Ligand binder design. Structure first.
Ligand SMILES: [Zn+2]
Ligand SMILES: [Zn+2]
Ligand SMILES: [Zn+2]
Ligand SMILES: [Zn+2]
Ligand SMILES: [Zn+2]
Ligand SMILES: [Zn+2]
Ligand SMILES: [Zn+2]
Ligand SMILES: [Zn+2]
Length: 186
């Protein structure tokens, strides 16, 4: 099990930035979206590698409703529902060409990755994510077992605040991870 670690996914980033200091009183002001997540269920961050669904059979729109993309369709008994909050999530700066890097403790492999980015004109700070507001930026073939996977993404004409949505179809069974990463193209 794993996540997108660079550009950090929403829950991985909240964990990386605040996990050693998760009750820091400055968090509400400095990173309100992480604060609300930690207040909803701290296990969304402690279990940063558990954002998956089993059995989707490749039909992701059937099991991930609009407005629930970042929780993987309110997966895992609602643990990650706070990741669907709309607001000024902390971004990672990326260039037009950037690498999506996943860490996987188990070396499951991938049948494929799908990578999307929110369209120009979509404002993640004030609008819920929907499938219709995504544009596909890459689809890959299979990756063999490894503790890390890298997807070299190339985009042009994307500026400012976006969300990257990475879908990892693992190879050990029908299991899929749904990772939102807030990014800033500048
Ligand atoms: Zn695993
Ligand atoms: Zn990093
Ligand atoms: Zn402030
Ligand atoms: Zn920046
Ligand atoms: Zn370029
Ligand atoms: Zn790693
Ligand atoms: Zn590890
Ligand atoms: Zn910016």
């Amino acid at each position: 099990h794993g996540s997108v670690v660079d550009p950090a996914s929403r829950n991985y980033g909240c964990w990386e930035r605040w996990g050693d200091d998760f009750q820091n009183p400055a968090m509400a002001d400095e990173d309100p979206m992480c604060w609300q997540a930690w207040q909803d269920d701290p296990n969304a961050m402690w279990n940063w590698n558990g954002l998956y669904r089993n059995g989707s059979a490749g039909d992701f729109e059937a099991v991930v409703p609009d407005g629930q993309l970042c929780s993987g369709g309110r997966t895992e008994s609602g643990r990650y529902n706070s990741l669907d909050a709309v607001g000024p999530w902390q971004t990672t700066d990326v260039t037009d060409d950037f690498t999506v890097k996943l860490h996987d403790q188990a070396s499951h492999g991938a049948d494929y990755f799908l990578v999307y980015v929110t369209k120009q004109g979509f404002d993640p700070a004030t609008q819920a994510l929907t499938w219709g507001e995504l544009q596909q930026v890459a689809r890959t073939g299979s990756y063999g077992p490894s503790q890390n996977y890298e997807i070299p993404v190339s985009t042009s004409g994307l500026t400012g605040r976006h969300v990257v949505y990475t879908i990892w179809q693992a190879s050990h069974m029908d299991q899929t991870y749904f990772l939102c990463s807030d990014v800033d193209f500048g």
